[PDB]
Structure formats: structure tokens, C-alpha cells
Amino acid sequence: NVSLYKYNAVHSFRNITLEFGYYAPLIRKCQSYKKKYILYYLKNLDKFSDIMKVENGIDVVDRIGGPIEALSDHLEDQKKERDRRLRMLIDQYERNVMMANDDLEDEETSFNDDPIVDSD
Amino acid sequence: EQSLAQQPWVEKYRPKNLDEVTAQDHAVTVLKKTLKSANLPHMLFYGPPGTGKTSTILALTKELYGPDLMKSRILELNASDERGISIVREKVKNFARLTVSKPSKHDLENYPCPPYKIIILDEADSMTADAQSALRRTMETYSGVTRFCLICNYVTRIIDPLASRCSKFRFKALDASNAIDRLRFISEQENVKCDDGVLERILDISAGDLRRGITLLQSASKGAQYLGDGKNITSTQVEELAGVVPHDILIEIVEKVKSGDFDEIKKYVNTFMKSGWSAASVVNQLHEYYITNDNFDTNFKNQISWLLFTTDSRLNNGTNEHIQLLNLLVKISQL
Amino acid sequence: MSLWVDKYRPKSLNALSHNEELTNFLKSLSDQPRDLPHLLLYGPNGTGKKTRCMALLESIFGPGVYRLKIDVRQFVTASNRKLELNVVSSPYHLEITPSDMGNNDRIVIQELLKEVAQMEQVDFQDSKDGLAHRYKCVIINEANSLTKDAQAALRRTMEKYSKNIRLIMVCDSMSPIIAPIKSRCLLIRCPAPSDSEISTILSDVVTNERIQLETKDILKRIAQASNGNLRVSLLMLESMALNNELALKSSSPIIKPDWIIVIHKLTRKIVKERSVNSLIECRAVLYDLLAHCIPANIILKELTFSLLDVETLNTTNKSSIIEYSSVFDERLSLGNKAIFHLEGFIAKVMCCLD
Amino acid sequence: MKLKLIVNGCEAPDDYKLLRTTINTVASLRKTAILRFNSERLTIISTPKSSLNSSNNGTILRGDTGQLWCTIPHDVFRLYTVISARELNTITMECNCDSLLSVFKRYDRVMNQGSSSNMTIKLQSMPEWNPICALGITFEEIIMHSFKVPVKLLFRAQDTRIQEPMINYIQLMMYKLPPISGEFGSAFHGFIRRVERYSNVNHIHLMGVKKDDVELKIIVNELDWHLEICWNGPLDSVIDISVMVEKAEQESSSTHEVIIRCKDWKVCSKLYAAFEEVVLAISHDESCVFHCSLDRGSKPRERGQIIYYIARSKGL
Amino acid sequence: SKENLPWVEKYRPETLDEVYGQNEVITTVRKFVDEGKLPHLLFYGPPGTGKTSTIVALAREIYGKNYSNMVLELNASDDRGIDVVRNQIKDFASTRQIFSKGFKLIILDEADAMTNAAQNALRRVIERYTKNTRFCVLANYAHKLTPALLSRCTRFRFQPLPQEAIERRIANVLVHEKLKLSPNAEKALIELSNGDMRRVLNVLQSCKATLDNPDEDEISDDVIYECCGAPRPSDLKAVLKSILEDDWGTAHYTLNKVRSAKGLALIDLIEGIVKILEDYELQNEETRVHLLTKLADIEYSISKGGNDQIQGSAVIGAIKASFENET
Ligand SMILES: Nc1ncnc2c1ncn2[C@@H]1O[C@H](COP(=O)(O)OP(=O)(O)OP(O)(O)=S)[C@@H](O)[C@H]1O
Ligand SMILES: Nc1ncnc2c1ncn2[C@@H]1O[C@H](COP(=O)(O)OP(=O)(O)OP(O)(O)=S)[C@@H](O)[C@H]1O
Ligand SMILES: Nc1nc2c(ncn2[C@@H]2O[C@H](COP(=O)(O)OP(=O)(O)O)[C@@H](O)[C@H]2O)c(=O)[nH]1
Ligand SMILES: [Mg+2]
Ligand SMILES: [Mg+2]
């Protein structure tokens, strides 16, 4: 749900069990750590503009199912948390459509050449 | 012309009448003369994929009744429909007991209109044993107004009482000997220019399935049209499209097997599975190469035939291709 | 931002950079899509089959095929067991994974797909006179994982309503596909990219991301560690770049899936010790792996080939190992609980080694 | 972009009722509606080809192909200030139907209370947020109630792609429905809504046969028994991969039939109840058009029109 | 009306005299009805041996032409759950005859498809109302019948139809039709029937169809094989001889040619070869073990599809390897 509603990416459950479930949380954890370090440096003081786009409460930075420790109503609460985060994702995505759409390329300069006028 | 070009070639060239069905005359003759005898029995069509069973039954139904009457005289059910025991006991029985609809004057003038309906149970082998048992006395009792047609690929999946009730029609495999005329006609209709023997190669590759052959011909024609060079289609292009392993790769595999080194065979198989070849095709090609070779003895051929049969049976169970292929090659290298 | 697996994903046939012959074949298919047959794409996982299907759809329809949204469809079983399925949709096509329904996948074929096949798609013509008709495109992910009943239900739906629907199924292996379904499809083999092409793609990504690379050899190593899985290659490239301050070096470790490392450790343990207690600990490891929803057959493959990679083992040991692997793979295919067969394989290997 | 409009319900209540029905229909049909303000009339569109509507993929998922078009002459509004540098001073926008419906419901409540104020509608540039603007709507309540609605302006290229469907008039059979206010109005209203008594019916087969000189029938064949509902009262007749749909051969030169969805029929019933002059046009095995016309004169004035196009749900 | 019927139904026996092959059972049941001491009956046998026909004919004889008014017939096509047994069967068995016409008859055709609970409920219904009602249970699979039900019924076994009865019925059908059957065709039909009359009648109808002019054309063995698409004995003999004497290449070519000549299927060839080998005199018994096991495995594999060429080569190799033991 997070991937679909934040990156327009659809992935299979099989690939999540095999590849994404381990790699994606690691990448997001590293990015979150880098963002925290950069923020701390700025407070104490564009190239990596894709790193500080990770949200603390919406992104997943933990291995799905926990670590594989082999050789080195919890379910209801997890479902409730999933529903809450899905609602937040839907709220975030709802305003995107009305905000703007890619549509096609037009004469935007001409549109700006006739600005709205409001006066009584 | 665009509307006529909206259909894949298999659906476009599906037989319209019984005359268009090819290579199945042994049953088509009986079905055709049923039009005059009006003595249609319960039927059990059985045979391998793409041999013309569904097409034959559809053509028969069209010929018997016509476009209008058919809608009131035909009940078709297949694997896409729910066919539980309750369905057999209620819906099928109710249709079988339904009074025979009155044909119009036009229908009587133009079509024989036999005084019975038809229930078609396509993919009958998917039905359960109990559901099949529920059909026995329904078919026997209402045979005066209803006739059943069961269709399947695996006849053993039909319970013995139903097989006894139905007159059996085996549909033969369509190969280069009996189905070449239809494929040549289709190629001529679509103006496909192919080298001599190309249709033979397609039919041999298809291995009894004319639907696969027609799809292959369409794919080759599309490739040639996109190329737009005006040249004839070649057998090499057909083999590439069909997924046949090139002869040089098979020769390399055979040399590796002859060498006998386990590590080398494992490495080569690991690299070979990269290309995504289907293990079934590779096994078939290996069988053809080894069984027909005159450089091996009788005991070798017996052992390899049993090994190939075991591997093919395991593959049929949806097993894991890399493991089965490596095991087969290791076993052969040990012969 | 988005993961590099999706960020630099090609969005058109002309953007494909490996397996040129496959691209040419797909373009030939897109020349006259009016009579496009049903398609079945098969090849190694993570090679770009879904990407190629989306590129083909874009060629037929346009970029709008990438404007995807998700809907939830509810199904009720004969036992009143309500459940749901995710359906992805673009204004021109649909995407479904019925295998996520387990044994209930057939219901999805019998209710949803059939309905989609039955509803003929027509629209008012903008300039011409009368309605215009267009067939719908449906993608079936993980086709090889469908039960035989669902595959049987697909047959007459594909045949009868060919005017309204065209199926594009994708699988990693055609062994589980019943013969009729293969007969009803145009089969397209999708080879995995070579190490050179994987390295080229990774180098393009590195240049785009402005990551300092000591030598190109690293990329090659990454390719050799992915076993041709481009998605895995990109994931490990991103992980390594992030873990090394966006500076890769020949000494930088290659990051592999954790379960793969666990299976390697299990193989080492099996080789070192062969006893009942060792078997019980192997059971514990196998159950830990299964708890993460790793498929049993995948575990069997990875364990088998990891064992075959051991240098100390002799020819007889490896031959017996592969024999047992084939037997227990068949048993898993025909079985109900995978633990029995995995344990049997490990016990047989322990017996043959000892 | 000045779009100054004044709406009063105490003068010419027919125009206010027409506008209310138009907004209700577009709200009940699709989530978003297109508004085209020309120098002569206002056109309200509910179509699946709009940028916002097409985001739902309705056509491929549920076959939402019907199109609603409504025309409102500028005389409806007391003040009509629409100035633009486009063709015929045309301004195109897309708006959400729920907010407009709520605002108009509040206005109706205020009017029913006893107020006789006027609604002023203007276009404004909200600093809070194809630039998105706001529709400033304000009115007095015997208290100056003001509400704003988001709106998205459209370009000429985007505007021109939304074209009203047309039909082959020569190959089209039209029937003049009895006026709802007439003695037969209740009978025809019940006849239209009869099929609603069958919950499990999804598609209805409309048929029209020559020989008051024609007759209309609704056929249902989804039940265990064949059902036909016939009207015996008076009824007068007015005298890429895309391919053309297949049309079944007509049974006779004087019979026209089409299969449509029940929801479209309910929409048609509501439209028929709303207006007085209603025409039902059938293009055999092609489509059904519901045309509601409102006539007003002074030098006859412009005729208010609501045209609902419904594509066939199944082939014949 | 009867002319339009399929032959399997058009030639259904009407009286007990028309039932052939089951002489002992027919004799006993006829004497029972003559003395009017009919007990509860079980008819056990394989498909198409005359069970349903026999029971219907017996009902006709007992009640004449009005048997439909005092006979309650139920089969697998009808729901026969415990509720049905408790209500419908119970009420029928516990009510008087229409005109005091002795006892009533309840026929439970294909009773092996009934649930265990219904069969258990049937026990006391059968026992208590024996004075007024008699039960008949027909089955092909006895293991589906509970021991209590089996104990309550007098058991009669319908054997596979002997050759003589099939010949007599074939002669009757040939006379009824305007058909001519050759002795070789009759032998082939009897061989392929396997004791089932339904197969005989269906194949005869198809053969009549195959004839261009049935009024004068005679059915030969070739017509029978064409209609059934079955191998000829000469084909089986040639294939077996090539397998047992010729080299691998020659055997493969012979099998391919024989199959391609008439589009023969491998399963029928295997079945015919098994029939041939069952009579072979083998000095080594291990050969029989190998033959049986390998051929059964091949048959099971064929039942699921697979590769036809590989299966044929497997048959060849299995026979060769098995017969290497006799060496
Ligand atoms: N005997 C045939 N004659 C002509 N065309 C055939 C024949 N058999 C198959 N085809 C072609 O292949 C297509 C499929 O034929 P089908 O009748 O559906 O085969 P089938 O035996 O019903 O396949 P299965 O058992 O459902 S996998 C037809 O539309 C034809 O174009
Ligand atoms: N003994 C028989 N004598 C003459 N015809 C027979 C005989 N048995 C079977 N038939 C013929 O085959 C048809 C079927 O006979 P049935 O009595 O229904 O066989 P059945 O034993 O009841 O089959 P099952 O067990 O229900 S599959 C009859 O209409 C007859 O034409
Ligand atoms: N630059 C480039 N990337 C590709 C190409 N083909 C696939 N990819 C990328 O590599 C990944 C392949 O994974 P995927 O599309 O899911 O393949 P599948 O699992 O076999 O269907 C994707 O992230 C693609 O973006 C290609 O031809 N060129
Ligand atoms: Mg078929
Ligand atoms: Mg019987």
C-alpha cells in the first residue's frame, strides 16, 4: 500500500518475500539516517535531493517479518495500523489529482497572458 | 476489412460447417449422416489439445438447428461455469426435461430441426465423480427429447458408467500428413509467402495441435510483414519463434554429457537456463537426438528411454525445471 | 525518492536496452495490434518481462497505460467466506494476480475475468458515426501459480470472447501450465540479460546518480552476484552505494538477501555435521525460513545448488544430492505440507554424505 | 476572466428548476462536471472523457459510457458578465459536483425558509493554493453567506477534445413521450419505473414498433420466465485498435430495438419526471437518446435542452 | 418415436424374456414373482449388464402396465439425503397400495451414491415395513454400501455378458434393422465390448452410419475398426514382433509408421500388447514383474498427458529390458 500510494509502483507479493522485503527497508533506513545526519549538520551549521523525501511515520525501515535469526492480538493491532496508514496515504493521494495533472503540453504562457480579474 | 481483421487466425479460421473439419472423417461422417437419420446418440468426444472437438460440436449444432432455433435448443456448460452436484441435479435436469420448442416455418423450411435438444458439457473431465454420477439416469430417462455431448482430453477422468452410456469419438492428432491442406489454405488466404517445407516444419513442431501451428504461422507472418523485405519465411525463423533450441546448443549439451564431468555439466546448465528455454522442449529434442542415433547400443537406449520418460513425467507434475534437467543430464552422463 | 528499480524503468519499446531481437519481435507484434493473439511470456525472474509487457501496451495504446490505480473486489465462497482481491487498472488495461487467492483463484477466473470478458467495451465516436469497439487487455501475473481448475476455467473464456479480451500471462516457468492453455497462447521467451548488459545498465544508473566508482569491475561483480536478476542487481547497487557514502570500492562488500546467507550457513552446517540433532537444528532453520513466506520449492533449489557448490564433496555425493533433490521436488509438487519433504531431503543428504 | 452571474429563484422559476435538475443529474452521474461559459449560453457536461473523470477508468471497469449535456440560455441569469479572448468568448472549467450540489441545496433551503435574495457567482484566485481557482458564491439570508468551490480551468486544446456525441438522424426512430403534467403522465411514469420492481434485472430491451401510431415495449429476459411490459396508451412519433460495433440486422424496417442498463433507465425516468417535453430516440442496436426540452417565449427565446446519450449495454 | 431414439435406449428390454446373459438371476426372480414371495433385492454388477432393465421389467410383470403408480424409483439424479429417507421414502413405504395390489416396490438405483447417514436411516424403514413394501438396491461398487444394508438384501450378481447372449442380441438387432454383419465383424465387436451391451449397440449404430448404402452394404471388421479408430490385430502383432526382434531404430520406425497409418493412439496399442503378452509362456517370472510394473506406470503417465513420443519409446525400452531377463 505504501509503495503504490507514494511511488506509483506495483510489486508482487512473491518479489516482496524474495527481494523487496529485505532490501527496501534497509535502503529506507540508510536514507533516513543520512537525512537525520544532514539535518543535524544544517542545524549546527540538492545533490542528494532524493534522500530527505523519506517520511518517518509512513516509510518502512524494518525488515518485513523481522530478522532471520536462524544461524545468526498482535495481528489485529497490525491490521489497525495498516488501515490507519492506508487512510493517511489515501488522504495524501486524493489532493494530487485535483492539484494538477500531466495531461498534455499546451500554451501555458498564453494562459498566463490573460490573468483573472476580480473587482466590483 | 478492419472488422474482419479483428480476430486471431485460430478464431478467424474456426470451421463454420462440418465440411471444414479436417482429418476427423471417421466421426464427421457419422455426425453428418445424423442430419438425415435424426438418430443422434449421446456423444463423448475425447482427444488431445487443438484437434477440433469444440469446433465440430459447434458446427453440428449450427447445421442441425440454425442461428435462431439453436438458442432455444442448446445448453452449453464448460469449465468456466459452476458445475457442482446441485447444478447437475437442478439446472441440467430441468433443461433435459424441458419441452421441445416449436420451430418456425422458416426453420423447418431451411433446416432439418430434429425433435430434441442438445446439452454440451465441454471440458467434462473437470467435473467431479459425484456430479458425473448425477447425470446417468438424467441422460437415460430424457433421451427422447435430449441428447448429451461430453468433451474431454483425458478420457480416464470420465466415470465408467457415463463412458458406457455415450458413444465414443476419438479425435486424432493433427500432423503434417492429415492437416497440411488446411494450413496451406490458411496461408494462401493470408498471402503468406514461405519456403517449401515451412508448413511441414510448423506441423511437426506443433506435435498434433493445429491451433499451435496456426498461431505459429500468424506470428511468422507478422514478423515477415514487419520486416517488409518481400522474402519468404524460413524454417529457422519458425524454429526460433517456436522456442526450439538451436542445434549447436544441443550439440554442446551432448558433448558436455559425453565428457561426464559433473562440475562442467552443472556450470553449463546454470548458464543455459539463463536463456529461459523450456525444459520440455529440451527433453523432447534430447529424446529425438539419442533414440534415433546409431552410435549407441541397445542397453543404452533402453536406459535412456526410461530416464527420459521419468523426467518428462516429473515435468508434467509442474516440477522445477533446472533441477530436473540437471538430474537428467547427470544420469545420462553416467550411462 | 522511488527505488532505482522503478526510477529508471524504461517506458517504451525504444527504451529497451537488452535483448534487441525480443524488442524487434515485440515491435512487429505492435505493427497491427488489431489481430493480436493471447500472449504468454516466460523466462527467468527479474529479467524484464513485466516491463516488456507494459512497453508493448504503451506502443498499442500510449503512455496512459502507466497511470495505474488500485481497486478492491469482494468475493464470497460457497461457505460464505468473504475475501478480497486487488485489481490494478489503467484506462486501457487491467492487472490481476489470482494466485494470491490460493485455492480460491478459480473463483476469480469464474466471476471477475468472465464478467470482464462478457462486457463488451464500446464508446461514442468523437468524429465518426456510430460507436467504436476496443478489446480489453488483461495481465495475469504469476500465471504458473494458478491451480489446474482456474487454468481450465480460462479456456473457453479465452476462446469465446476473443473479440472483447486479450490475455497477456507472465510466468517464470511453463512446467506448471496445462497443455490447453499453452496451446491457446503465443509463447514468448524472454532471455535474461548478459553480464555486460547488466553492467552497462548499472553504469548508466551510477552516472545518473553521480556515484563515484573506483573501477567498473565492481559492477561486473554485482552482475555475477545477481545471477541475471536485474531487479536484484539494482537493489544491491543501491544498498551498497548508500552503505558506502555513495562511494563504491573494490573492497565494498556485496549485499545478498539475508535468507540466501542463512541457506549458505545451513549448507555449511549440513556438510560439517551429520546426526539426528543436526537434523533437528536444520528443522529449526527451515521453519524460520518458512515463517518468512519463502516458497518451499525455492528453498529446495537454493539449498540444493548451495550444497552442489561445496568443493570437498565428490562426484558420487553430488549425483546423489541431485537425485534426492529431483525426487523431493516432485514430492513437494504433489504434497500438502512442505516440511516433510524438506526434512526428507536433508536427511537423505546427511545419509549419503556420512 | 470575469464570470459574474446573478441567480434568482423568485423570477422565472422554470429556469431555476432546470438548473437544479441539471446539477442534480450531473452530481448523480459522475463525480466531476465540465462548465463551458459562452457569450450566449452555459453548457454543463458530464462525460467520462474529462481529465478528472477519466482518472476513475470507468469505461473499462463498469462501462460508464453515457454522456449528459445540458444547455442554459444566458437569459436564465439576471446578470451575465462573461468576457474572454477565446472563440465566442468561451471559458472552460472543471468542477466537483458535490460542493455545488451542497451549495444549491443550502440555497433551496434558504429560499423555502422565505428569503428572496440573489446568488452572486464569480471566479476568484485563491492564494491558499492548469491553475486552480475558486468559484466565489455568495447570497444573503434574512447575514452574508459565502462559500467557495475549487475549479480547474481548461485550455483550448483540452476544451476542443470534449465534443458532443451525434447520431445518424436519418437512421434514428424518435417517439414523443406523453407530457408528465397530462392525464397520462402518471401512467407513463409508472410504466417507466415498472421494471424497478425486479431487483435482479440489470439490462432491459427497449423495442419500438410501428402501429397514436406506434408502440413501445420493455422486455426482460434475465428472469426464469420471459417478461414483456407494453404501453397501450397514446404515443406519437416525431416525423489504433478501434473498430465499428457490429449491428444486428433489423427484423423489419419499422421496428427499432436496443438493450441498455437499468441505471440509465432510472436516470431517464428521473429526467422525464423533471421536465414536460421529452423525446426518446432509438438507434437500432446502437444507442438511446433522452432529450428533454423546455420552451419559453416572450421573438421566441432559446430552448433549454438536456440530452442524455446511452450506449448499448449488449449486442442484439 | 422409438425410431428417433439412440439404439442403447431403443433396444431396452421390455419383458424379462428380453434380458439375456443373466439366466440364473432371471430364473430365480421369475419364480419368486410367480410365488409372490419377493424379498428385498440387491443387484450388484458392472456397467451395462441389465440391472436397471431387469428391475423395470420385473416391476412391469408384477404390476402389469400400471407399474408407475405403485413403484417409487429414485436414483443419483435425485437428492436422497437423510431428510428424503425420513419423509418421502418413509411415507411411501408406510401407506397402503393404490388398489390393495399386494405390496409396494421402492427402487434405489445407483444406491452406492447415497450418504452413510441415509443408508443408516434406511435400515429400520426396510425392516419394519417389509410386510407392505419391498426394496431393490442397484450398485456397481459394493464398498459404498454399509454392512447393515448389505445384510438386509438378498444379493444377485450380474456377470459380464457372455458371448452367446451378445450374439443373440446382435442377431435380433440385425433383423430389426436392415443390416448385415460379417462373422469377423461380430468377433471384433464381442472382443471390444468387454461384456457391456451399451458399447455393442453404440458401435453397431456408428457402423450402420459408416455404411454408404446400409440396405446392401455389409459391415466388415475394417468398418468396425474405422468407426472405433482401434488398431487391428495385425498391427499389434507387427509392433510386438518388431519390438521383440528388430533393433531400436527399426522398432521406433515400425511403431511410428503403424501409428501414423491410421492415427492410432498409444494407450490402445499398449492395451492390445498387454492382452497378447498375458498369454505368453515365460520361463522367467521376473520378466512378468518388469512388464507389468513398467507398463502400468506408462499407462498412468499417459492418463495425465505428457509427451507421446517419449511414452512410445518408453514402452519399447520397457519391453526390451523386461525380455532381457528371459535370456
Ligand atoms: N480438425 C480441425 N480442423 C480445422 N481446424 C482445426 C481443427 N482442429 C483445430 N483447429 C483449429 O484450432 C482451433 C481450435 O480448434 P478446437 O475445436 O477448439 O480444438 P479442441 O480439440 O476443442 O481443443 P481443446 O480440447 O479445448 S485444448 C480451430 O478454431 C481451428 O482454427
Ligand atoms: N442383459 C441385457 N440384455 C439385453 N440388453 C441389455 C442387457 N443389459 C444391458 N442391455 C442393453 O444396454 C442397455 C442398458 O442396460 P442397463 O440395464 O441400463 O444396464 P445397467 O447394468 O443398469 O448399467 P449401469 O450399472 O446403471 S452403468 C439396455 O437398454 C439394453 O439395450
Ligand atoms: N535500462 C534498462 N532496464 C530494464 C530493462 N529491462 C528491465 N529493466 C529493469 O530491470 C527490472 C526488471 O524487473 P521486472 O520488470 O519486474 O522483470 P520480470 O520480473 O521478469 O517481469 C526492472 O526494475 C526494470 O526497470 C532494459 O531493457 N533496460
Ligand atoms: Mg475445445
Ligand atoms: Mg442402471
d(CA E173, CA B201): 48
**For atom 31 of ligand 2, which residue has the closest CA?**
E12
Say if CB E58 and CB E31 are below 8 A apart: no
Pairing of strands D214-220, D203-210: antiparallel
With left for phi above 0 and alpha for psi between -120 and 50, is residue E315 left, alpha or beta?
alpha
Neighbours of D113 (CB within 10 A): 9
**Nearest protein CA to atom 7 of ligand 3, as residue:** C48
Q: Are residues B316 and E301 in contact, defined by beta-carbon separation less than 8 angstroms?
A: yes
Q: Has E80 been labeled as part of a binding site?
A: no
CA distance readout (Å), B324 to B242, B269, B272, C295, C318 = 22, 11, 14, 18, 14
E312 CB within 6 A, ligand 2: no
Instruction: Show the CA angle centred on residue B289, arms to residues B283 and B291, nearest 5°.
Output: 95
For the record, the C-alpha cell of E223 comes out as 468398418
Distance CA(C307)–CA(C318), nearest Å, equals 8
Residues across chain D: 316
Q: A100 CB near a chain C CB, below 8 Å?
A: no
Instruction: Give the phi and the psi of residue D248 in degrees, each rounded to 5.
Output: -70, 145
| E50 burial type by CB count under 10 A (0-12 exposed, 13-18 middle, 19+ buried) | buried
d(CA E103, CA E108): 16
Q: For E30-42, what is the HEC assignment?
A: HHHHHHCCCCCEE
Cα E194 to Cα C343: distance, rounded to the nearest angstrom: 47
What are the distances in angstroms from CA B207 to CA B174, E50, E94, E307, E315?
8, 42, 63, 9, 19
Alpha-carbon Rg for chain D in angstroms: 21
Q: Is-contact E62 E105, C-beta < 8 A?
A: yes
Angle, CA of E46, E50 and E51, to the nearest 5°:
75
Binding site membership of C16 for ligand 3 (Cβ less than 6 Å): yes
**SS3 of E296, please?**
helix
Report the alpha-carbon distance of residue A120 to residue B155 in Å, rounded. Answer: 86
Q: Largest alpha-carbon pair distance within chain D?
A: 65
* Helix ranges, chain C (H): 4-7, 20-31, 49-60, 105-108, 114-118, 148-160, 179-183, 195-209, 217-226, 230-243, 258-272, 276-291, 296-308, 315-334, 338-353
Q: How far apart are CA E300 and CA B156, in angstroms?
A: 10
User: Rounded to the nearest 10 degrees, how much is the dihedral formed by the CA atoms of B188, B190, B191, B197?
Assistant: -60
Contact B274/B322 with Cβ under 8 angstroms?
no
User: Which residues neighbour D280 within 8 Å (Cβ) at sequence distance 6 or greater?
Assistant: D174, D175, D177, D216, D268, D288, D289, D290, D291
Q: What distance in Å separates the CA atoms of residue A70 and residue C303, rounded to the nearest whole number?
A: 15
Q: Tell me whether residue E53 is annotated as binding.
A: yes
CA of B281 to the centre of ligand 3 (A): 26
The neighbour count for residue D217, using CB atoms within 10 Å, is: 14
Compute the distance from residue B161 Cα to the ligand 2 centre, in Å.
Answer: 11
- Which among C154, C183, C326 has CB closest to B212? C183
Give the closest of D51, D122, D157 to A106, CB-based.
Answer: D157
Report residue C71: phi and psi, to 5°.
-135, 155
**Smallest CA–CA separation between B227 and chain D, in Å?**
20
For residue D100, the tally of other CB atoms under 10 A from its CB is 22
Among all residues of chain A, which has the CA nearest to that of D153? A111
Q: Provide the residue type at D282 as one letter.
A: I
CB contact under 8 A, D244 and B6: no
Number of Cβ atoms within 10 Å of the Cβ of B49: 23
Secondary structure of residue C79 in the 3-state scheme: coil
CA distance D138 to D144: 7
The single residue listed with the C-alpha cell 419391498 is E134
Phi/psi of residue B74, each to 5°? Answer: -125, 135
Which ligand 2 atom sits closest to the C-alpha of E22? 1
Q: Do C134 and D242 touch (CB under 8 A)?
A: yes
Domains of chain C, with CATH numbers?
4-189 (3.40.50.300), 195-248 (1.10.8.60), 258-353 (1.20.272.10)
- At D104, give phi and psi (nearest 5°): -70, -35
**Residue A25 cell numbers, joined:** 527497508
* Grid cell locating A50: 532524493
End-to-end Cα separation, chain C, in angstroms: 52
| DSSP 8-state class, residue D88 | G
Among C39, C273, C15, residue whose Cα is nearest residue C169: C39
Name the residue type at position D285: D
Q: Are C259 and C232 in contact (CB under 8 A)?
A: no
Beta-carbon contacts of E296 under 8 Å, excluding residues fewer than 6 positions away, are: none
Q: Are B148 and B135 in contact (CB under 8 A)?
A: yes
Residues of C in contact with D166 (CB under 8 A): 129
Nearest ligand 2 atom, CA B137: 26
Ligand 3 site, residue C39, Cβ cutoff 6 A: no
E154 near E42, Cβ under 8 Å? yes
> How far is residue B242's CA from residue B220's CA, in Å, rounded to a whole number?
10
Q: Write out chain B residues lying below 8 Å of D244, CB-based.
A: 2-3
Q: How far apart are CA C110 and CA C89, in angstroms?
A: 19
In contact, E106 and E80? CB cutoff 8 Å: no
Q: Which residue has the cell 423450411?
A: B109
Taking CA atoms, B257 is separated from B254, B264, B283, in Å, by 5, 9, 14
Give the whole-angstrom CA distance, residue E188 versus residue E194.
11
Spatial separation of the C-alpha atoms in residues C234 and C254, rounded to whole Å: 12
DSSP string, E214-273: TTTPEE-HHHHHHHHTPPPHHHHHHHHHHHHHS-HHHHHHHHHHHHHHHT--HHHHHHHH
Amino acid making up residue C6: D
Give the HSE-up count for residue C104: Cα atoms under 13 Å, Cβ half-sphere.
Answer: 16
Cα–Cα dist E73/E70, whole Å: 10
- C193 is annotated as contributing to ligand binding: no
Contact C132, D242 (CB under 8 A): yes
Q: How many Å lie between the alpha carbon of A42 and the closest alpha carbon of chain D?
A: 29
The bridge status of strand C69-76 relative to strand C186-189 is unpaired
Buried b (16+ CB within 10 A) or exposed e, D78-98: eebebebeeeeebbbbbbbbe
C-beta C52 within 6 A of ligand 3: no
C-alpha to C-alpha distance for D279 and D292, rounded to whole angstroms: 6
Long-range contacts of residues C260-267, Cβ cutoff 8 Å, at least 24 apart: C260/C302, C262/A68, C262/A70, C262/A71, C262/C288, C262/C289, C263/C289, C263/C299, C263/C302, C263/C303, C263/C306, C264/C306, C265/A70, C265/A71, C265/A72, C266/A70, C266/A71, C266/C303, C266/C306, C267/C303, C267/C306, C267/C307, C267/C309, C267/C310
CB of C10 sitting under 6 A from ligand 3: yes
Resolution (A): 2.1
- Is residue E126 within 8 Å of E135, Cβ to Cβ? yes
How far is Cα E316 from Cα B305, in angstroms, rounded to an integer? 8
Q: Count other Cβ atoms within 10 Å, centred on residue B181.
A: 11
Determine whether B323 is exposed, middle or buried from the number of CB atoms within 10 Å of its CB (0-12, 13-18, 19+): buried
- Give whole-number Cα distances, C121 to C158, C161, D64, in Å: 16, 12, 10
As a whole number of angstroms, the distance between CA B130 and CA B149 comes to: 18
In chain B, where the domains are located: 1-174, 175-244, 245-335
The DSSP code for D195 is G
Residue C48 has φ and ψ, to the nearest 5°, of 120, 25
> What is the per-residue burial (b if ≥16 Cβ within 10 Å, else e) of C211-249?
bebeeeebbebbbeebbbbbbbbbbbbbbbbbeeebebe
Contact between D237 and D228 under an 8 Å Cβ cutoff? The reply is no
The amino acid sitting at D96 is N
> Is E53 a pocket residue for ligand 2 (Cβ < 6 Å)?
yes
Q: Pocket of ligand 1, candidates B17, B126, B211: which has the most ligand atoms within 8 Å of its Cβ, to mutate?
A: B211
Taking Cα atoms as reference points, which of E130, E127, E128, E156 lies closest to residue E142? E156
Give the torsion sign (CA, B230, B231, B232, B237). Answer: negative
Which chains sit next to E, with 3 or more Cβ pairs under 8 A? B
Q: How far apart are CA C345 and CA E33, in angstroms?
A: 66
Ligand 2 atom at minimal distance to the Cα of residue B160: 27
Q: Which residues pair with C79 in a beta bridge?
A: none
D20 min Cα distance to partner chain C (Å): 27
Task: State yes or no: C50 annotated in a binding site.
Answer: yes
Cell numbers found for residue C51 = 516491463
Element (H, E) at B210: helix B210-227
Distances (CA, A) of D1 to A101, B291, B295, C242, D130: 22, 85, 91, 51, 14
Strand partners, E139: E44
Substitution target from A94, A107, A111 for chain D, most D beta carbons within 10 A: A111
- Residue D304 — φ and ψ, nearest 5°? -70, 135
Distance CA A50, CA D164 (A): 45
Instruction: Name the phi and psi angles at D94, rounded to 5.
Output: -120, 135
How was this structure obtained? Answer: cryo-EM
CA distance D262 to D201: 7
CB D48 within 8 A of CB D59: yes
Tell me which H or E stretch contains B306.
helix B298-316
Per-residue cell: B78:
464448460
Annotated binding site of B for ATP: 10, 14, 47-55, 153, 211
Cα A28 → chain centroid: 10
Nearest CA to ligand 2 atom 4: E19
**In sequence order, what are the residues at sequence separation of 6 or more whose Cβ sits closer than 8 angstroms to the Cβ of residue E190?**
E163, E166, E167, E200
Q: Label each residue of A55-111 as H, E or C.
A: CCCCCCCCCCCCCCCCCCCHHHHHHHHHHHHHHHHHHHHHHHHHHCCCCCCCCHHHH
Residue owning grid cell 504562457? A109
What is d(CA C37, CA B223) in angstroms, rounded to the nearest whole number? 14
Q: Is the Cβ pair C325, B327 closer than 8 Å?
A: yes
Nearest to residue C170, comparing CAs of C195, C193, C141? C141
Give the number of other CB atoms < 10 A from CB of residue D200: 7
